[PDB]
Amino acid sequence: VTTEQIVYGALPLTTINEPECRAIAITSINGSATLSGVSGPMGDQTDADLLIQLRGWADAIVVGAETARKENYGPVVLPHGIKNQRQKLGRCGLPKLTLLSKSLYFDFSSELFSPDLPSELSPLVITQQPANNSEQWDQRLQKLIDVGVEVIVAPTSTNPLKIAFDALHARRLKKISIEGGPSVYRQALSLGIVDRLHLTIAPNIICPVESPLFGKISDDSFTTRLVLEMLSSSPNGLIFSRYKVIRD
Amino acid sequence: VTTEQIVYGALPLTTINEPECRAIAITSINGSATLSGVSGPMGDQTDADLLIQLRGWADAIVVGAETARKENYGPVVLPHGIKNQRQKLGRCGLPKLTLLSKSLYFDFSSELFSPDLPSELSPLVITQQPANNSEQWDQRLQKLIDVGVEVIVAPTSTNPLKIAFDALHARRLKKISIEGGPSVYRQALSLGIVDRLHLTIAPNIICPVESPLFGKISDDSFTTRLVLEMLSSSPNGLIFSRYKVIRD
């Protein structure tokens, strides 16, 4: 079972050109997304490859800024082969990285925020007008603007994932990978926009659960059932699973 | 992949006669042991069969009384075939059901507490002398005694799982299945007595996590790594996994 199978195989013609949103996530067997505050250490090479494979499938990546930060995200890269398969299929070489940030706090030493970064590598920042004012946020927005980063400010009322989802669709970006933030997974599930889930289950137990896989913002509860479509494991004993998310 | 494989296959001669303790558990993909307060509804027939298969492997079953209660446990039953395989191999027909109960609250309408229940079906109750006194507990202990149930009272200081573990070993009961209670799983892991884990991952998401798989008694934290030994799924998309628990 290859990563290409996991991402592309045993599917209908919905690939052909149908919009699709997928969430990709890693968890301990008991539902923690993090070990020592990060997800990376739980993953192995197979898992890292699968993320890249799904990125090769995606038109856009949606991720919470703090997850992007903690996971040392940089400008999106893809293997020479994938980018070429993409471009020949008339697709942009790289998916658009979309960062959800209510604070707008970013590390500007990152290449993601260099003023001369090629535009296709520049992240789309999605934020919200803060309800009660923050001069930090104002100053941060300005800094982003001054380096040339595109920032969409959602209204105070609105849902930032819905906004991102629309901004990306309105941009003809149809395949969306949500690489997380538990709270991002959570907002997406409860909006019902996740069609499939790639979940890696790492051979570890973490007590207490550092970071509940789908968030601890109990606010609005929900359950849902899944259809297992693909099941596999790495030689390090990580389980890779693809589920279809069942609506209503 | 059969349930008999999952339980018995790809192992060393440690089966031959080596003491072994295994925990068996079900979880949502995000680490809840319960849906609507119970585990049963998450399981399918394959999973129920696997529990029975592991019971056929076991000399004793250790389970928290409240889990036994919520899951409508009765006297242990095994298929005619398994019991015969057991007895011919010189084993007691049925494993000893061992119930961990600090309150000693039981439903005496259960056949488990009928005074004429055959002794091999009678549960071993493991409790603790309550630190500050409870006349309820006294009265309940007496009721159990009056129906003929064997009750071991651990000291106030001691660990009830350690006590159960010893009581069962001292009884020549070498293969122990812990069918749970998250807090029972938790106490067992932190005592380091779990050699292997059978974990079923059910195709559902439950937010908030109703019942953290390995307990929410944060008191003493821990992590551990696992070696995946067996991986399989049912036609309903439940994942069955067997891991070896790695000590120190």
> Solved by what technique?
X-ray
Q: Give which of B207, B219, B225 to mutate to test A binding, by max A Cβ within 10 Å.
A: B207
Q: Which residues of A touch B186 (CB under 8 A)?
A: 207
Tokens of B155: 């000291």
Nearest chain A Cα distance for residue B115, angstroms: 40
Nearest chain A Cα distance for residue B11, angstroms: 16
Q: Give, for B178, the enclosing helix (H) or strand (E).
A: strand B175-180
> Looking at B6-129, which runs of residues are DSSP E strands?
20-28, 60-64, 96-100, 124-128
Q: Where are the domains of chain B?
A: 1-248
Q: Hey, is the C-beta of A221 within 8 angstroms of any chain B C-beta?
A: yes
**What resolution in Å is listed for this PDB structure?**
2.3
First to last CA, chain B: 31
> Looking at chain A, which runs of residues are DSSP E strands?
20-28, 60-64, 96-100, 124-128, 151-154, 175-180, 196-202, 204-207, 222-233, 239-245
Return the closest-CA partner of residue B187 out of B225, B160, B151. B160
Q: Which residues contact B146 (CB under 8 A, 6 or more apart)?
A: B115
d(CA A46, CA A234): 6
Q: Hey, is the C-beta of A213 within 8 angstroms of any chain B C-beta?
A: yes
Q: What is the DSSP letter of B35?
A: B
How large is the greatest C-alpha to C-alpha distance in chain B, in angstroms? 52
Cβ pair A35, B226 in contact under 8 A = no
Q: Please tell me which residue of chain A has the smallest CA distance to B200.
A: A29
Burial class (CB in 10 A: 0-12, 13-18, 19+), A146: exposed
Q: Hey, is the C-beta of B204 within 8 angstroms of any chain A C-beta?
A: yes
Nearest chain B Cα distance for residue A96, angstroms: 28
Nearest chain A Cα distance for residue B30, angstroms: 5
d(CA A62, CA B63): 43
Q: What is the DSSP letter of A217?
A: -
A18: left (phi over 0), alpha (psi -120 to 50) or beta: beta
Q: Which residues of B touch A29 (CB under 8 A)?
A: 27, 31, 199, 201, 213, 226, 241, 243
Quick count: other Cβ atoms within 10 Å of Cβ B89?
A: 7
Q: Hey, is the C-beta of B1 within 8 angstroms of any chain A C-beta?
A: no
Cβ pair B195, B21 in contact under 8 A = yes
Nearest chain A Cα distance for residue B184, angstroms: 14
Q: Is A40 helix (H, G, I), strand (E, B) or coil?
A: helix
d(CA B52, CA B63): 14
Interchain pair A238, B228: CB under 8 A? yes
Interchain pair B207, A225: CB under 8 A? no
Q: Please tell me which residue of chain A has the smallest CA distance to B213.
A: A30
Please give the C-alpha separations between residue A118 and each of A76, A114, B107, in angstroms, as whole numbers.
11, 9, 70
Strand order in the sheet with A151-154: A151-154, A124-128, A96-100, A60-64, A175-180, A20-28, A196-202, A239-245, A222-233, B204-207
Nearest chain A Cα distance for residue B90, angstroms: 36
Q: Hey, is the C-beta of B221 within 8 angstroms of any chain A C-beta?
A: yes
**Judged by CB atoms within 8 Å, which residues 167-196 of A form the interface with B?**
186, 189
Fold of B1-248: Dihydrofolate Reductase, subunit A (3.40.430)
Nearest chain B Cα distance for residue A43, angstroms: 13
Helix ranges (H only) for chain A are 3-8, 14-17, 45-57, 65-70, 80-88, 135-147, 160-169, 182-191
d(CA B207, CA A218): 7
Tokens of A147: 């380096």
Q: Hey, is the C-beta of A37 within 8 angstroms of any chain B C-beta?
A: no
Interchain pair B31, A35: CB under 8 A? no
Looking at the DSSP bridge assignments, the partners of residue A233 are A239
Q: Which residues of B touch A205 (CB under 8 A)?
A: 189, 214, 222-226
Q: Hey, is the C-beta of B124 within 8 angstroms of any chain A C-beta?
A: no
Chain A to chain B Cβ contacts (< 8 Å): 129
Angle between helices A80-88 and A45-57 (to 10 degrees): 20
Q: What angle do CA A173, A176, A180 make, to 5 degrees?
A: 140
d(CA A11, CA A206): 34
Is the alpha carbon torsion for A66, A70, A74, A80 positive or negative?
A: negative
Interchain pair B228, A221: CB under 8 A? no
d(CA B133, CA A106): 58
Strand pairing class (B204-207; A222-233) = antiparallel
